Amino acid sequence: NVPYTPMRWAQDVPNTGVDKNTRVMQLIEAYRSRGHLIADTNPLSWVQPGMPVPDHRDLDIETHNLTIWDLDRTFNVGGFGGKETMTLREVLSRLRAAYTLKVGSEYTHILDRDERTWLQDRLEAGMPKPTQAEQKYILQKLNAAEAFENFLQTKYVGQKRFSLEGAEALIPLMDSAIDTAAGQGLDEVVIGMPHRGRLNVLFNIVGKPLASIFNEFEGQMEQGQIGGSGDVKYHLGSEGQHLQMFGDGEIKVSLTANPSHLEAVNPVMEGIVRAKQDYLDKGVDGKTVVPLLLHGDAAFAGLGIVPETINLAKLRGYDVGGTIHIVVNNQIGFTTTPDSSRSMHYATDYAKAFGCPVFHVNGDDPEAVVWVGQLATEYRRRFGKDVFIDLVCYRLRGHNEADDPSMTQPKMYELITGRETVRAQYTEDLLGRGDLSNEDAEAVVRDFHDQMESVFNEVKEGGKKQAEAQTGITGSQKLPHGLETNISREELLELGQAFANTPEGFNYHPRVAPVAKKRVSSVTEGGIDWAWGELLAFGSLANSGRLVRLAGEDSRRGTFTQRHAVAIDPATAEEFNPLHELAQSKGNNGKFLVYNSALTEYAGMGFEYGYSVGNEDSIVAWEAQFGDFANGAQTIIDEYVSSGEAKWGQTSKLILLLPHGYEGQGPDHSSARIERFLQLCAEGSMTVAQPSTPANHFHLLRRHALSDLKRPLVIFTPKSMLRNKAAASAPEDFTEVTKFQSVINDPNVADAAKVKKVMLVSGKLYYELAKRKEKDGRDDIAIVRIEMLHPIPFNRISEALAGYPNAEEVLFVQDEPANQGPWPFYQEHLPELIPNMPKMRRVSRRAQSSTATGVAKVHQLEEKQLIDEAFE
Amino acid sequence: NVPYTPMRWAQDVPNTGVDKNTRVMQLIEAYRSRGHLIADTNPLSWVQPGMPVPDHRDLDIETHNLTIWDLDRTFNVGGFGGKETMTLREVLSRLRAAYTLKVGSEYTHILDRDERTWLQDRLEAGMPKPTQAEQKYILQKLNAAEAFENFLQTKYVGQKRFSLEGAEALIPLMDSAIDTAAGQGLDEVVIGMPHRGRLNVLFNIVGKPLASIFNEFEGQMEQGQIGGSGDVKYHLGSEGQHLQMFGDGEIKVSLTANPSHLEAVNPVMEGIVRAKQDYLDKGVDGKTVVPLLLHGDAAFAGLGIVPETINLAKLRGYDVGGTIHIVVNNQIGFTTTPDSSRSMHYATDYAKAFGCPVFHVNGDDPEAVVWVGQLATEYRRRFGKDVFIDLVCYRLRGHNEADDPSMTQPKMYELITGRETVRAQYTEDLLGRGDLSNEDAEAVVRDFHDQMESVFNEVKEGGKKQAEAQTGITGSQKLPHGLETNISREELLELGQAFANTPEGFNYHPRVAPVAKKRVSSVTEGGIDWAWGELLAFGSLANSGRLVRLAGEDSRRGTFTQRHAVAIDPATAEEFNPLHELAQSKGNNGKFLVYNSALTEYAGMGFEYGYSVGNEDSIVAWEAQFGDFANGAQTIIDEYVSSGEAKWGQTSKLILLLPHGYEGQGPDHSSARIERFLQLCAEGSMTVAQPSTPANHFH
Ligand SMILES: CC(=O)SCCNC(=O)CCNC(=O)[C@H](O)C(C)(C)COP(=O)(O)OP(=O)(O)OC[C@H]1O[C@@H](n2cnc3c(N)ncnc32)[C@H](O)[C@@H]1OP(=O)(O)O
Ligand SMILES: CC(=O)SCCNC(=O)CCNC(=O)[C@H](O)C(C)(C)COP(=O)(O)OP(=O)(O)OC[C@H]1O[C@@H](n2cnc3c(N)ncnc32)[C@H](O)[C@@H]1OP(=O)(O)O
Ligand SMILES: Cc1ncc(C[n+]2csc(CCOP(=O)(O)OP(=O)(O)O)c2C)c(N)n1
Ligand SMILES: Cc1ncc(C[n+]2csc(CCOP(=O)(O)OP(=O)(O)O)c2C)c(N)n1
Ligand SMILES: [Mg+2]
Ligand SMILES: [Mg+2]
């Protein structure tokens, strides 16, 4: 069982042509680059039959025209191993010791020389010999990891736990990284991980009490929110403190909640870290919250959200000073082997794309594992980049605890079955070297077992409560009754003046200057448009001292060139953020941060959700370019935004700004899928609104921000109505009007007694209907707007309908197809909420399997048809 | 305007310590590995302010302890440039010519030496000098690309087209690759691409008639399905023939339909290619349908479906002999610059993960572009692996034709605005070298313009039909009235006996043997369970002569250990597929193929959808591990499966097997979201069923 290729008999070669000194230094570069290909990183003597074996002839001396006869000859190695001259024998020994033992490194791909040299020096120096106390501490962690898994197997044989057996070295690895971070003087470590060994991590790393874990297996689950639905045991988060064993350092450890959907936590945990770092506010030299992200090998290679999130690592609005990635490479998925799982040689090969170091470490060598954890954490601190650890291990049992893996992988599990564990191996190693005594070895096992038995007994003696019906989370949070969202005239005037207070040598772009000038004058004269109404909300909130973050694709300028949150001087390319400067001058340390996201909805929205969780006091808005593309981030909407509170008691105030409107731009530039958002809405999960005026949008945003209702807000924003003069708001609507209006009654009714027909509408379609009403002089029609879709303001709608006693019929008018828009929601619910209301008649486009027509001229035809149908 | 670093004044260094021969060969490896970092691949003199500039000191001779005084000294280069000895001056010249001109190569990361040597030899040999006929042909393609874009700008000023202006070299690149494939004797090229320059590709590459394109701008759209809703002009597919200009080769070219959702076509087009290759049935030496996949730089880096699909390249049930990837690197998204778009140095850096060559080529050097296209196609044929071309270009106008990019990128568009086009540059180059004459240059421009004017006039003289209401696709296809789906007793007994007809030295796993024994006896005694009922359906269909493909996570065994489509001998690890063997013995060339998918729903289901489109006669079933995870492939369900027929007239018979049932396994192992599937269902778009008996599922 020698891993290297034997020396080959050959005749000595003359030192002609390429010099042997050249050949030697080529050999050195070969090992530094490709030495990992033959490194002893695999605990099993296993090669996957269908996996292409890479060529590694570059590591043989024959390839470099060197022979056994050169071994004792001296060569100039140019400072290799801190020596100018060396024998080939010594060169080979040093190369093999550094690159072909338990740690396989990929770093030569790194372009920065200082980075490469830093890694090179440390890898070639080797792992320092640990102290006996350190060795004993590693054994304790290994023991705890294995004993915990074995205890659950004994007490709960027929319960799914996703054991860490075969990968117990993860616990000392994580502990090593966290301990190193504590010694660096950092503030917190945020962990995101999958199912694999989650309970083990919760107990041994985070420090969740053992009683809680045992209660979960018994059936008693800890409730997050009052009347919450809950979730399985291996989807929950926790918080704890980590104290340095051999130091005075202390660091906070947090584990984030995640769904069963693999790798969905990646963008969320990054956002949490960023929000935490921003709160600490230690500047560019800070970044004192460490993201520690765990992955499975199949998921890391398979799913695309992984590289998508890594892509955010160095972006201005997303940088967190690097993420430590640990891939638990157990060399299998559920049943799919790596041959059928990926096309890459290594699971961690995405690191090559991003120019980040990779450490492949053998999961049966705990000391090497601990060293790699320390080295990775030091690299992150020094260079502020992502680092990838490939923990090469195996999965002792099936995917779950009630599955037989021998049916499909008989040969692989012939090697796995019957092996001695890493704990056993390490104990034998320590005893062999005389670094540990026998009675100490038995003490470690006995002490920990007694701890678990005692705790188990206390849980058992407690009474087992029977199953009960779960109510719901409808009234778990309070509505802000009596809250006034208007600002003073002085505040409004000051917000307007922000766009006039340009820096000394700053000039607006000629096509932006009119927009800025209008904003300065609108706060007194009027004609405040949608974009200005939105910025007034965010500006006023930032003035009060809040951190307001707006992110999304093309958000700084706006997709429709409406926002201009940050203006750029054409000449100097100097940026100017008027509202941020105003906020900072008010002395409440308010901030208005606007970022252009990367081309991503999944990672984009996920990051903003995470931000809202990491800092509850921040106002975070994610803007889609079009609402149609939000379905790209369906996992985030389904698993986090909509159901986060009910499953985990995790609340968020995330705002989604989704452009919506049927204007004849095709099936993927028309609808934000209102019907899908309303289908997810239950037990008052989130607020869904489609405001018709800038002022109403202003009030909606402020109500959300100033309330204690910690639930998401989904706003369907307009496209063409951004520049519609009829929609503009007066200044009094921001200062005199105190509250958001969920229902706006018809402002053009001369006599309410004459009204025979009432039209319910939501969004831009009102203005078309209003225009037609004025043109035709229809005094018998009243057009009522519904600004808030969910929850349903049935009291306000009833009140509006009651104001027209002679109303015979009620029409629900929408631009969307019949099987889309708010109709399907309102058709089912509204009749129940208002029994006395007449039978609603739908007026809309026909039901379609698509969103909208591709033909623009058809759109005009259907629009005309739609309005004609409304007016008899 | 000299691109290289000036030679530095320095004193001569003694040949002490590391030998200078060593240093020289280190320099050679430096250029082969990292020479691309300083290659003249960018048409613009532009560096993105927020983008981290990589260190490239390894390419300076000073770093290797060499000086100007070594330039004329001779060193042993060990067969570099087919010579044993060389001066440092000559070494530098050859390295710079091969690695720092218009083509930047990344290949040293490739682990296979034969692959690496093959690429090394061709890159260091250099681009062969093209003939005047070849040069003239490149100009014609450049002219067609630019003139087409300019014509649309003139005739339809206020209409969105997503022009290819600034990236016109894409057309000769694609033509080069397709021409090379025709010369290799291959059967078809399947293209998947985004919006950027789609109309240009449809006309100049696929060969869609120009009248059709002009009609679309007028408002007259070609209807796919009777009463279909349709889609915008730059989402449609087409088919055509490509004839070799300088050869007797001929190849079929197809462009697949796609939604506005970027990179969603990637898994679908791969499935189409695989289905086509399987139909041809030329074995492992075949793979004669080329996937040519185009990407934008922001989308290629940003979206995760991209690496997700590339991950399928070498899998048993998904291998198509390699995909040719072209990334149109115009160095911008909508408004987001690469600094705010990616963290990778290059957009094509995913290739490093998969161990595939990358060619960065300057989009203003047409001859280099054409060479790279040929080299990529040859590499695919030889090694059967993915190859990545980074076409470094720019975007002349805004994202669309009605957007001002100067508001947000003033400095970048100070360089872009006012440039001479690649066509203009190449024409001037050809005239300068005397490879082209003046009257020929004017002929190319005039002849093509006259072609477009004539066609435009014929479209204009035709009557413009008014807008009409679109009915629907409910009755566009007929229901099978009177169809009987029962099989004979003899057929049923034979299907049962398939599990008893084990190979000579084959034995079942002890926990599988009871299942096999029950299947043999159930066909007479009874008690046929769900899994057996399902296999009886697929088996009976394969017997008739159909290609039945079942794919999904853990599908061969089954998530719930129910299927056992392929049995494995514990001892020998020998596989046995009873139903496939039976089908092949019936003499109708039927097949029952069962595959374990990778960990992916998006790419997994997308590939099966593609398979159903590429071969209409095949029976394709995708199985989710649990129905709950199907929402991972929401783009495929929304944009392809549910609405494919109504938008493009593209039909599919894909079967989705989604495990469903409330049994107390938690919120992500209970529901397949039946309510969501029923909400998409309209105008009889798809069949949704929940059978209660195995027989009913069979029928
Ligand atoms: C996400 C949520 O808002 S949780 C909602 C809790 N309730 C439910 O989900 C079920 C019961 N729902 C209901 O009774 C209605 O849907 C309600 C709550 C909207 C009340 O209906 P109406 O009285 O017609 O609506 P109206 O717009 O007048 O709202 C009444 C008050 O609630 C406030 N309110 C209503 N919805 C919200 C909301 N989403 N966020 C904040 N405040 C809200 C209003 O600001 C108003 O305050 P006020 O008393 O100072 O005037
Ligand atoms: C996706 C589609 O199937 S497109 C369906 C076309 N129609 C529509 O979309 C509009 C709605 N129309 C209806 O619902 C029609 O009345 C029906 C026929 C589909 C409803 O079926 P019913 O008459 O209630 O029941 P039944 O299941 O007996 O259907 C009658 C026949 O249609 C066939 N059929 C019904 N649905 C399907 C289907 N999805 N695929 C194939 N055949 C079908 C049945 O096999 C049966 O054939 P038979 O005449 O040989 O007995
Ligand atoms: C997106 C998604 N697809 C499928 C599943 C089902 N699933 C859960 S764990 C698992 C295996 C993944 O293997 P790997 O990532 O290697 O992790 P391991 O279980 O080996 O630690 C699968 C398919 C899931 N939860 N999420
Ligand atoms: C998934 C998705 N997100 C967002 C969009 C909106 N969008 C359309 S084109 C575009 C820019 C794409 O940039 P790049 O990939 O570089 O292509 P280019 O337009 O520059 O050719 C964006 C974000 C989309 N169509 N699909
Ligand atoms: Mg795994
Ligand atoms: Mg681009």
Side-chain angles (χ1 to χ4, degrees), chain A residues 553 599 601 625 629, chain B residues 195-196 260-262 296-299 330 332-334 399:
Chain A
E553 293 170 2
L599 205 180
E601 288 75 46
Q625 190 144 55
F629 302 126
Chain B
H195 56 113
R196 183 62 59 195
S260 185
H261 297 187
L262 294 174
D297 49 338
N330 53 7
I332 196 170
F334 191 131
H399 179 246

Side-chain angles (χ1 to χ4, degrees), chain B residues 586-606:
Chain B
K586 298 288 282 178
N588 300 309
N589 193 53
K591 301 174 187 174
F592 183 52
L593 308 178
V594 193
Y595 299 107
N596 286 336
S597 177
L599 201 297
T600 172
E601 287 75 46
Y602 196 165
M605 171 190 307

